[PDB]
Amino acid sequence: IVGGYTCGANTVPYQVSLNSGYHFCGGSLINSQWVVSAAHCYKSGIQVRLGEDNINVVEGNEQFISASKSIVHPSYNSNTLNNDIMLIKLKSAASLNSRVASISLPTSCASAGTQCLISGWGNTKSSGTSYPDVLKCLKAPILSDSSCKSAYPGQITSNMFCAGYLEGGKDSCQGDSGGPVVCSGKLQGIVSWGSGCAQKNKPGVYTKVCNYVSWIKQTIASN
Ligand SMILES: [Ca+2]
């Protein structure tokens, strides 16, 4: 996250870190046994880390649970990043409380102008690299589809939305991928892609979760 603020420990209780020997992507806990992330975060051998603030220090609220199954969306296209969503089933159920909690799926899509919270452990610089150890947060609005399509001609599908600031300076970045965009207490987006980070006229692009609720619910019910 570029241009954000330190969230505070366990203030974003649905935020997960995906670990394969190191943090590589975020995700969101949607019930005691399932996480949703980005398909471009797929790899084998994932450990899901819940209850984290400092990802390099054991602080006492963590739960480390291996993945038993990963399911990439059937229509994910790695070239265009259309349908950039993936479900991860945990080997055992997480223990839920105030510091580790699930986030609700949306019943309706959010409109442009709605303010959302984006979080992650990704890069904090737009030029160069500095990775934080503690979770960072950013408040940003959903942008209109017309502004999003004007920023990225020919690249925005109906399964994507833009959020952030056309003036630059505040965005999600590398290492935030897969993490949550939460608006009015519901998971509306997944950190997916962008052209660089925090550049003028190049806001972040997010997977539009409201289009996938039926697929998520049906998949969880049968796996
Ligand atoms: Ca920790």
The strand pairing partners of 69, in sequence order, are 89
| Exp. method | X-ray
Q: Is residue 108 domain-shared with residue 161, that is, in the same domain? A: yes
Q: What resolution in Å is listed for this PDB structure?
A: 1.4
Non-local (6+) Cβ contacts of 52 within 8 A are 15, 16, 17, 61, 62, 135
Q: Are strands 86-90 and 160-163 parallel, antiparallel or unpaired?
A: unpaired
b vs e for 137-164, b when ≥16 Cβ sit within 10 Å of the residue's Cβ? bbebbbbeeeebbebbeeebeebbbbbb
Residue numbering of the annotated binding site for substrate: 171-172, 174-175, 177
d(CA 1, CA 17): 14
Domain count, the chain: 2
Q: Write the single-letter amino acid at 88.
A: I
Domain carrying residue 170: 1-12+103-210
Output the CA 62–ligand 1 centroid distance in Å.
6
Q: Is residue 4 domain-shared with residue 65, that is, in the same domain? A: no
Output the CA 168–ligand 1 centroid distance in Å.
31
Residue 17: left if φ>0, alpha if ψ -120 to 50, beta else—which one?
beta
Q: Is residue 97 domain-shared with residue 107, that is, in the same domain? A: no
Q: Is residue 111 domain-shared with residue 195, that is, in the same domain? A: yes
Q: Is residue 109 domain-shared with residue 83, that is, in the same domain? A: no
Catalytic option among 28, 84, 176, 192? 84
CATH of the domain at 32: 2.40.10.10
Non-local (6+) Cβ contacts of 216 within 8 A are 30, 36, 87, 105
Q: Is residue 76 domain-shared with residue 176, that is, in the same domain? A: no
Q: Write the single-letter amino acid at 213.
A: V
The DSSP result for 160-206, as a single string, is: EEEES-TT-S-B--TT-TT-EEEETTEEEEEEEE-SSSSBTTB-EEE
The strand pairing partners of 144, in sequence order, are none
Q: Write the single-letter amino acid at 103.
A: I
Catalytic option among 28, 102, 119, 177? 177
Is residue 84 within 8 A of residue 165, CB to CB? The reply is no
Q: Is residue 52 domain-shared with residue 110, that is, in the same domain? A: no
d(CA 199, CA 206): 16
Residue with tokens 């990963």: 70
Strand order in the sheet with 5-6: 5-6, 136-141, 115-120, 180-183, 186-193, 204-208, 160-163
3-state secondary structure of 31: strand
Query: Can you count the helices (H) and strands (E) in the chain?
Result: 2, 13
